[PDB]
């Protein structure tokens, strides 16, 4: 028993992290087979950051402008190309530690683990959710770009995020591993701001089920609600609408606890309207929305 | 910027995890050089759990009673011995992936990363604090015993915890890697219960400093307090006394933010007496005490 924000074990990804330097800019790269992937803004200079033309900067570069170090073995760059907001640096050695992997783009509301790195060396690992507004609430300092987010399924790493920047609100923005940004952000210099965020309703419900599985029951009631009358309340509190598919996804947790999804919705409505009155759920005084139903089942299997 | 509960990268520890089976009991072991360490209750059976005599059970065992698997390469046990609540199984191969390591016992109030494992295979990684009552608030299911907690300093893994059991309150208890329990617990069957816990005051202060470093300032004031008048309030709210050494440890955070430790104490006193009135700090509606000053500096270096 117990419930914690749990990251995937990071070893398979640690073996892929390299350091990429171009000019006086050093950041992190991801070394899979004989390609290193990194953010294309590694080729920018201070004088072209408001709106660099990345195609010009790249045509003016050669292979020898890119210094790639794995630990401190130097990898020779033998080819370079741009794919959207990511650079692909072909190197003369295939990474012997290349895991089975996929490049997957995730959906708002899904979670993943982040391996924060600096200078090619892993610093720490933590769990993030892709917010409905396509930002993530992470922990990233100068030098962390090129750090990646991932899930593991069996022994296949599905990479889903590469870090590019921090917004003025302190949240973070990046791309998938094909270099396509999550959300309406660009790797330049704008006053760029995220769209208004909402709470991931299905995840809050999943987390209430985790709480029940862990003996927290004070918020339950006999009330049930209709999906319509629940979504009326959700809209008022800036929660995303709940769909029948969300109810279906919550099925196994429903069956494990014997609490119908719409009964748990009745509990959430009461929590939204009355708050907690000084009590906690799984150690939180806020309703937590960064656990998916899968995160709960994975951690709470058999109580 | 940003602040998250961050674990250490788990790769160096993943390479040490093995599966240890004796009888019908399978749990996790830690393979360093030519020794596998695991909880001694792996030799228990259902009929001797209230108070096993572990010296009898062990004398009645042979090397061939212990099946040790790394991945699925079988390691031959060539020697066995008991060290307090841990077994040391000598095996015929030194672990090629053995990192530089230390066996360190930590203090209440210090943090560490846990690599939760089942059947020798790492499941996830998360950060824990050793509570003042020598329990940890983790996430452990049946089969997780032998999972270890650790810190990393440079490239040396300091192992500090091996998991043995869950208490009735849902918290967890274990030993250091010499097999000496943290706290007044035993690896048998008792109605055993933890002593009353307290809040780690120096860590709450460190976390307030992290919040300031991340732009959360609403809880500050010009008030300052004396260390004595603060500890009077702390005692009332079940917080541990703050010492001059704690004030010294908080020095660098004090200097980085320009807020004197005793000024930050004045803020904490107000927070204890008035609560937050519906606001949050670093995304929490509770005062967080599982970040050490070191955790903050490590994550918040240079804003
Ligand atoms: C890459 O390492 C770095 C990561 C951020 C540094 C500070 N915290 C980060 O996550 N990426 C950048 O610095 C990019 C570079 C480009 C283009 N730029 C930004 O993050 C811009 C931030 C900003 C904030 C407020 C106003 C303007 C720009
Ligand atoms: C080892 O894998 C296991 C870990 C716990 C299982 C359930 N969650 C755990 O963290 N260790 C045990 O099961 C040990 C074995 C011994 C001795 N026993 C307990 O954890 C006893 C728990 C308990 C709770 C309430 C009343 C009595 C006993």
Swiss-Prot record, chains A, B:
Crosslinked residue numbers (Glycyl lysine isopeptide (Lys-Gly) (interchain with G-Cter in ubiquitin)): 5, 90
Catalysed reactions listed for this entry: TSAVLQ-|-SGFRK-NH2 and SGVTFQ-|-GKFKK the two peptides corresponding to the two self-cleavage sites of the SARS 3C-like proteinase are the two most reactive peptide substrates. The enzyme exhibits a strong preference for substrates containing Gln at P1 position and Leu at P2 position
Coiled coil: none
Cytoplasmic side: 1-303
Activity modulation notes: Inhibited by pyridone-containing alpha-ketoamides compounds 13a and 13b. In turn, alpha-ketoamide 13b (tert-butyl (1-((S)-1-(((S)-4-(benzylamino)-3,4-dioxo-1-((S)-2-oxopyrrolidin-3-yl)butan-2-yl)amino)-3-cyclopropyl-1-oxopropan-2-yl)-2-oxo-1,2-dihydropyridin-3-yl)carbamate) inhibits SARS-CoV-2 replication in human lung cells. Inhibited ex vivo by michael acceptor inhibitor N3. Inhibited ex vivo by compound 11a and 11b.
Active-site residues per Swiss-Prot or TrEMBL entry: 41 (for 3cl-pro activity), 145 (for 3cl-pro activity)
The Peptidase C30 domain, residue ranges: 1-303
Function: Cleaves the C-terminus of replicase polyprotein at 11 sites. Recognizes substrates containing the core sequence [ILMVF]-Q-|-[SGACN]. Cleaves and inactivates human TRMT1, preventing tRNA guanine(26)-dimethylation of tRNAs. May cleave human NLRP1 in lung epithelial cells, thereby activating the NLRP1 inflammasome pathway. May cleave human GSDMD, triggering alternative GSDME-mediated epithelial cell death upon activation of the NLRP1 inflammasome, which may enhance the release interleukins 1B, 6, 16 and 18. Also able to bind an ADP-ribose-1''-phosphate (ADRP).
Subunit description: 3CL-PRO exists as monomer and homodimer. Only the homodimer shows catalytic activity. Interacts with host FBXO22; this interaction promotes the proteasomal degradation of nsp5.
Protein name: 3C-like proteinase nsp5
Highest classification ranks of the organism: Viruses, Riboviria, Orthornavirae, Pisuviricota, Pisoniviricetes
First-to-last residue of the parent protein present: 3264 to 3566 of 4405
């Amino acid at each position: 028993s117990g419930f914690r924000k749990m990251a995937f074990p990071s070893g398979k990804v640690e073996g892929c992290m390299v350091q990429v330097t171009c000019g006086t800019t050093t950041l992190n790269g991801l070394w899979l087979d004989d390609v290193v992937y990194c953010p294309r803004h590694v080729i920018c200079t201070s004088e072209d950051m408001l709106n660099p033309n990345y195609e010009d900067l790249l045509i003016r570069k050669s292979n020898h402008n890119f210094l790639v170090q794995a630990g401190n073995v130097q990898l020779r760059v033998i080819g370079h190309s741009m794919q959207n907001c990511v650079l692909k640096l072909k190197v003369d050695t295939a990474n012997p530690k290349t895991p089975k992997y996929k490049f997957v783009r995730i959906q708002p509301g899904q979670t993943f683990s982040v391996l924060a790195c600096y200078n090619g060396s892993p610093s720490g690992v933590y769990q993030c959710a892709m917010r409905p507004n396509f930002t993530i609430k992470g922990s990233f300092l100068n030098g962390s770009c090129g750090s990646v987010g991932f899930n593991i399924d069996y022994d296949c790493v599905s990479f889903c995020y590469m870090h590019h920047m921090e917004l003025p609100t302190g949240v973070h923005a990046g791309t998938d591993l094909e270099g396509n940004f999550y959300g309406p952000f660009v790797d330049r210099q704008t006053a760029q701001a995220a769209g208004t965020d909402t709470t991931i309703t299905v995840n809050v419900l999943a987390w209430l089920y985790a709480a029940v599985i862990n003996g927290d029951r004070w918020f339950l009631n006999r009330f049930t609600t209709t999906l319509n009358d629940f979504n009326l309340v959700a809209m008022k509190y800036n929660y995303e609408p709940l769909t029948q598919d969300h109810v279906d996804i919550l099925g196994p947790l429903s069956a494990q606890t014997g609490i119908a999804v719409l009964d748990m919705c009745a509990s959430l409505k009461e929590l939204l309207q009355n708050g907690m009155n000084g009590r906690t759920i799984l150690g939180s005084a806020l309703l937590e929305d960064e656990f998916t139903p899968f995160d709960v089942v994975r951690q709470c299997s058999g109580v």
